[PDB]
C-alpha cells in the first residue's frame with residue numbers, strides 16, 4: 001500500500017472545491033471521464049478536482065458534509081471478474097469492512113463495464129449500493145456504461161442529465177480553458193529531458209529493481225518468429241529475457257508492455273500542423289496545488305510525447321473534438337466537430353459513423369477536416385495517455401524462469417476511413433529484431449492458475465491465440481511428470497483454420513502429446529471442411545468423459561481467447577453437458593457452471 005495523501009476534504013477546503021471525482025481505472029477510460037466531470041463543475045458555478053482513490057483514505061468521506069453543497073462522484077470501471085480496478089482495490093476493501101456513518105454525504109456513480117462479461121458493471125453497482133447502505137444519499141441515478149456498445153455515448157447521455165439534476169438540487173445554474181501552460185526550454189541539459197521512460201528520469205537507462213508498472217524492466221527480445229504459414233495474417237511468438245530483473249511469474253500471469261507509436265504517423269502529425277516536434281518543452285498545470293504537475297513526463301519533446309506518452313491511434317472522444325472545433329477555420333468543419341458531443345441527432349450519428357465506425361484517428365481527422373489546425377501543445381494536452389498492452393504469458397516459470405514468452409496476432413486492417421490501421425503494440429513488437437531490441441515490461445499476477453494438486457484434471461479450451469497461457473500450462477504439467485509427480489489428465493481443445501496453415505505450436509504440441517504430457521490433443525480445423533468445426537463441437541463430442549472429469553474428478557476448466565463469441569459458445573456447451581448428465585434443467589445447469597466459476601474451477605482469460 002502506498003503512503004496516503006492528507007485528507008482530501010481538507011484539500012478541498014483550502015482550494016475552494018465542492019466536488020471531487022474519483023476514478024477506478026485500469027486503462028484510463030474512467031480517469032478521463034472523471035477529469036471531464038471535474039472540469040464541467042466550473043460551467044455550473046462550482047469547482048471540482050479529480051482524484052485517484054488509491055492515494056487517499058476514503059474514510060474522510062464522513063467529513064465531506066463540512067463543505068457546503070458538496071458532492072462526490074465515482075467513475076468506476078470493473079476489471080478481472082467483476083472486481084475493482086487495481087487502483088480501487090483498497091477503496092473496495094474499505095467499503096466492505098467499514099461501518100462509518102456517511103449521513104449528509106451526497107454522491108453519484110457512473111460505472112464502466114461491458115455486457116459481454118459475467119458480472120456487468122459489478123464495481124459501479126457495488127459502490128452505488130454500498131454508499132447508500134452506509135447512510136449517504138444518491139443525488140443522481142447510477143450510470144451503466146457499456147463498452148460492448150458505445151461507452152462514450154453512454155457517458156454523454158448520463159452527463160447531460162447529471163448536471164441539470166445537480167444544479168436543480170443545489171440551486172446553482174449554468175470559452176475554452178486550458179489546464180496546462182506551455183514552457184519552452186532553450187539550451188537545456190540533455191540529462192534532464194525525458195526520452196520515453198515512464199517514472200523516474202533515466203529509469204530506462206539505469207535499471208533498478210523492483211520493476212513494475214511505474215518502473216518497467218527493459219527485456220531483450222531473444223526470439224521473434226512467425227508461427228503461421230499463410231500471408232493473410234501474421235501470428236508471432238516472442239521470447240523476452242528477464243534475467244537479473246528479479247521478476248517472478250507463474251503460468252497464467254500476464255505480461256504488460258509499453259510500446260512506441262509508428263514514427264511515420266508521429267512525423268505526419270507534426271508536418272500537417274506545421275510544428276517542430278523536436279522542440280523541448282514542459283506543460284505545467286496552471287493549478288500549482290494539483291499533484292498532477294504535467295500531462296505526461298516533462299520536460300520532453302513533442303516527438304517523444306507523441307511516440308511514447310500519447311494515444312494517437314484510437315478514435316478521439318467527443319470532448320477532444322469539441323475543444324478542437326475552435327481551431328477549424330471552415331465553418332462547416334467547426335460545426336461538425338462541435339456537434340460530435342451531441343447526445344442525439346445527426347451530430348451523434350456522424351460521430352458514431354465518421355469517427356468511431358470508420359476508426360478515424362487524430363491524423364485522419366486533421367486530414368479530412370483540413371481547416372482544423374490546432375497548436376501542437378494544446379493537442380498534446382488533449383490526447384489520452386498511451387496505455388500498456390497485456391499478453392498472456394506463454395511459458396512456465398518452472399521451465400523458463402528467466403524468459404517470458406508471448407503469442408500474439410499482429411493487428412492490421414483496412415478501416416472505413418480509407419486508410420490501413422496498424423495495432424500499436426503488435427506492429428512495434430513485430431518489428432523487434434533479436435540480437436539489442438528492448439521491450440519495457442512488467443508482470444501482473446492473475447488468478448488464472450493450474451490446480452494446486454498435480455493429480456487434478458485440467459480441461460483447457462483456447463482456439464487461435466487463446467492457446468497462449470496453455471503452452472505454459474502444458475510445459476509445466478510436462479515438467480511435473482518429469483519430476484516424478486502424479487499428474488492427472490491434461491486435455492487441450494485447440495482450434496485454427498487449417499492444419500498446414502495456422503496450427504500454432506504444432507511441433508511442440510505433437511511432442512507433448514507423444515510424450516504423454518497431453519492426455520488428449522483435440523484440434524478443431526474450422527476450414528478443412530464445408531461446415532465450421534469449432535472447439536465447442538469437440539467438447540460436445542466428448543460430453544460424457546468431460547462430465548466424468550467435472551462431476552467425479554473435480555476437473556478445472558480454463559477458457560482463453562475471444563470473449564466476443566467463442567467464450568459464450570463454449571460456456572453454453574458446458575451448460576448443455578451439465579444439463580444432460582446431471583441431469584437438470586437449463587436454469588440449474590447454468591447455476592452449476594456459475595458455481596464452478598465461484599469455486600475457482602472455471603477460469604477465464606478472454607479479451608476483446
Ligand SMILES: Cc1cc2nc3c(=O)[nH]c(=O)nc-3n(C[C@H](O)[C@H](O)[C@H](O)COP(=O)(O)OP(=O)(O)OC[C@H]3O[C@@H](n4cnc5c(N)ncnc54)[C@H](O)[C@@H]3O)c2cc1C
Nearest residue numbers: 389390391392407408409411413423424425426465468607
Ligand atoms: C488480459 C488480456 C490478455 C491478452 N492476451 C493477449 C494475448 O496473449 N495475445 C494477443 O494477441 N492479444 C492479447 N491481448 C490483447 C492485447 O492486449 C492487445 O489488445 C492486442 O494485441 C492489440 O494491441 P495493439 O496495440 O497491437 O492494437 P491497438 O492499437 O490497441 O488496436 C486495437 C483495436 O483495433 C480495433 N480493431 C482491431 N481489428 C479491427 C478491425 N478489423 N476492424 C475495426 N477495428 C479493429 C479494435 O478497436 C481493437 O480494440 C490480451 C488483452 C488482455 C486485456
Ligand SMILES: Cc1cc2nc3c(=O)[nH]c(=O)nc-3n(C[C@H](O)[C@H](O)[C@H](O)COP(=O)(O)O)c2cc1C
Nearest residue numbers: 025026027028029030077078080082113114120121
Ligand atoms: C481483463 C478485463 C476484464 C474485464 N472484466 C469486466 C467485468 O468483469 N465486468 C464489466 O462490466 N466489465 C469488465 N471489463 C470491461 C471494462 O470495465 C471496460 O472496458 C471499461 O471501459 C474499462 O475502463 P478503464 O479504461 O477506465 O479501466 C474488463 C476489461 C478487461 C480488459
Ligand SMILES: Nc1ncnc2c1ncn2[C@@H]1O[C@H](CO)[C@@H](O)[C@H]1OP(=O)(O)O
Nearest residue numbers: 463464495496497526534535565566569
Ligand atoms: N465463435 C467461435 N467459437 C469457437 N471458435 C471460433 C468461433 N469463431 C471462430 N472460431 C475459430 O477460432 C479459430 C481462431 O480464430 C478459428 O478456427 C476460427 O474459425 P473461423 O475463423 O474459420 O470461423
